[PDB]
Nucleic acid binder design. Structure first.
Ligand SMILES: [Mg+2]
Ligand SMILES: [Mg+2]
Ligand SMILES: [Mg+2]
Ligand SMILES: [Mg+2]
Ligand SMILES: [Mg+2]
Lengths: 88, 145, 228
RNA sequence: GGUGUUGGCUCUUGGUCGCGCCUGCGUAGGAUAGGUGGGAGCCUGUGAACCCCCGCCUCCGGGUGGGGGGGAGGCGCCGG
RNA sequence: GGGGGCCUGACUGCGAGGCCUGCAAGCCGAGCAGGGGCGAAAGCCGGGCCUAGUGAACCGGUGGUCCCGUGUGGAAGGGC
RNA sequence: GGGUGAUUAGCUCAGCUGGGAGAGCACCUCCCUACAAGGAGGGGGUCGGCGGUUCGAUCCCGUCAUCACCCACCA
């Protein structure tokens, strides 16, 4: 899946081919192909433990925004999975 | 990436000079290893208010001496103590020097904040070097009889 | 000996790479040069092209308000009623084809062409290769155009200028003369480029601009900033 | 192949475009005269010529320069 | 049909009337104006003695054109 | 079309970043040997034609021509 604050995902939008022209005429060749985001894991600490983020390179620092936001936040309770969920 | 550091790494500058670095250099290094901070508008004027404090703090702790420097030096200090007539019987201690202000001149000054490595055992209108802050050296007039 | 020590001179008092204002700056350019008893303009400027591409040979002529000054002798060559209608000034005491061997062995002191392509079969044989690249060959666009030559040997007193751009852009305004007031050294750079901006080369990927400098026969150098 | 994931340190190499610099070799002709355009003065008494070091190229012939106490003349016209 | 001279009518704007024929085509053509060639003039010249030597339409290049040109003025594209 | 390249004797071919076209095989003969190795002479060339710069071009430059390789634009 895509997931994460990007709220991004894959799209099937068409990929086609056209042998050039413009000063004469341009060809055709179609097909349907998949487009994917640039999602990568993201390590981060948050005081205790680490936690990964399958987020896209568009909104990477949003985590570092999110982290730098979670200053005075009741962050612990022994709940690492629960922390990510609580990350806004 | 505009970020400020707090350990002067002589490759990107001394503490205080924000620097643009490659994001990876900041993503997988600095902040995790407690070397720098993401200087956001929030974390700008945050610590920018800090430097607006200590740099201005040295005023209610600095001039507070000068409002007493050119005032305290315009006075004596007399410690009447029975003693010999060329060397004191006993001694006079900085710890005890302070309360001499309390039993006559009614001022509260700190002991060990006073230059006196050893106690004085002989008399004479002697003059000491009090410290209210390691910046405004004030010389203190004392006397024993 | 070496190179001279006065060359390390006037430039320290010119500020090379700057502005000057060209026109009103020529007035102290007058005290920049201080050459002999003369001065020239020297524009040059190298094109942004190639010596080849067919034969962009390029020829032309210039105007020039006042003129030149001294002499080129002219002398010229023809046969019939040619110099007959052309001997009030630049030309005098020609003769005919019983003299050209004074080019060979008689009188050696010649310059300037005018004339008319009427006997090319003989000079294209005797002086058809061993003279020309000095700046000759009767040619057309060079002071050798039929009966129109009638308005040419007095046009020397106006303009010459051989548009030989060659491999090096070249061109060279040589009419200053120093003591010809400074006016004859102030109001002609524009009327120079106006004739230089003429039958330029056609089809070229680049600029038609370089250096210009405007220097004398032995004046300063180092750029100027060409525009006006 | 390019780019984001992707970060620190360093050695070198090619090119492009300006600048400051090294050259430019048939015979003839002092001589090793790239090109074009002017050009008669140019330099010199804030310094030249006959004399020591060095560098670069080099066609062994020299061409080009930073250097020495010396201190009045040397190249260009033109010829060929 | 074979030679010589002067020429560019292998013009422009039209074009009655007709051969053939399903359509599209194809083919001949007197007559006029602008301007010209030849000939003293009558006159002829809208390619070649003729019948074969060719390609609808769509798309696009090049040159002109009182044209259209998106709120308006240029511009871009289109149109003849 | 766009650009890299050739091409010179009969032949497989050099010329050097410009300066009288040449080494081999083949052809004629003369030699020492009778053959065939091997030498000496001479002939042999439109440097693929056409041009431009150049005092001067096998070489510098631009179209042709016959190829070869690569990328299409053909309604
Ligand atoms: Mg997915
Ligand atoms: Mg197009
Ligand atoms: Mg003349
Ligand atoms: Mg003028
Ligand atoms: Mg890659």
């Amino acid at each position: 899946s895509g997931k994460r604050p990007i709220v991004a995902n894959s799209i099937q939008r068409r990929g086609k081919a056209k042998r050039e022209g413009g000063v004469g005429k341009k060809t055709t060749g179609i097909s349907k192909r998949r487009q994917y985001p640039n999602l990568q894991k993201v390590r981060v600490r948050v005081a205790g433990q680490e936690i990964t983020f399958r987020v896209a390179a568009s909104h990477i620092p949003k985590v570092y925004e999110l982290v730098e936001r979670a200053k005075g936040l009741r962050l612990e309770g022994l709940s690492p999975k629960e922390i990510k969920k609580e990350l806004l | 990436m505009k970020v400020i550091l707090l350990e002067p790494l002589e490759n990107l500058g001394d503490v205080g000079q924000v620097v643009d670095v490659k994001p990876g250099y900041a993503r997988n290094y600095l902040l995790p290893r407690g070397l720098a901070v993401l200087a956001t508008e929030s974390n700008l004027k945050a610590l920018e208010a800090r430097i607006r404090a200590q740099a201005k703090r040295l005023a209610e702790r600095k001039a507070e001496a000068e409002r007493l420097k050119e005032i305290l030096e315009n006075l004596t200090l007399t410690i009447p103590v029975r003693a010999g007539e060329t060397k004191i019987y006993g001694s006079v201690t900085a710890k005890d020097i302070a309360e001499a202000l309390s039993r006559q001149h009614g001022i509260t000054i700190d002991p060990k904040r006073l230059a006196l490595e050893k106690p004085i055992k002989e008399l004479g209108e002697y003059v000491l070097t009090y410290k209210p802050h390691p910046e405004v050296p004030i010389q203190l007039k004392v006397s024993v009889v | 000996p070496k190179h001279g020590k006065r060359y390390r001179a006037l430039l320290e008092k010119v500020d090379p790479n700057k502005v000057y204002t060209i026109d009103e700056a020529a007035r102290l350019v007058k005290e920049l040069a201080t050459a002999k008893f003369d001065e020239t303009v020297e524009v040059h400027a190298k094109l942004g092209i190639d010596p080849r591409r067919s034969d962009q040979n390029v020829r032309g002529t210039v105007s020039l308000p006042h003129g030149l000054g001294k002499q080129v002798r002219v002398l010229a060559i023809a046969k019939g009623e040619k110099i007959k209608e052309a001997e009030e000034a630049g030309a005098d005491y020609v003769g005919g084809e019983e003299i050209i061997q004074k080019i060979l062995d008689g009188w050696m002191d010649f310059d300037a062409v005018v004339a008319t392509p009427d006997v090319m079969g003989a000079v294209g044989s005797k002086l058809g290769r061993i003279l020309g690249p000095r700046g000759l060959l009767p040619n057309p666009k060079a002071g050798t155009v039929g009966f129109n030559i009638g308005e040419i040997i007095r046009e020397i007193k106006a303009g010459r200028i051989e548009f030989r751009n060659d491999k090096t852009g070249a061109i060279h305004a040589p009419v200053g003369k120093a003591s010809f007031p400074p006016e004859k050294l102030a109001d002609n750079i524009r009327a120079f480029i106006r004739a230089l901006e003429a039958h330029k080369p056609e089809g070229a990927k680049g600029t038609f601009l370089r250096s210009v400098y405007v220097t004398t026969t032995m004046g300063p150098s180092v750029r100027i900033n060409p525009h006006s």
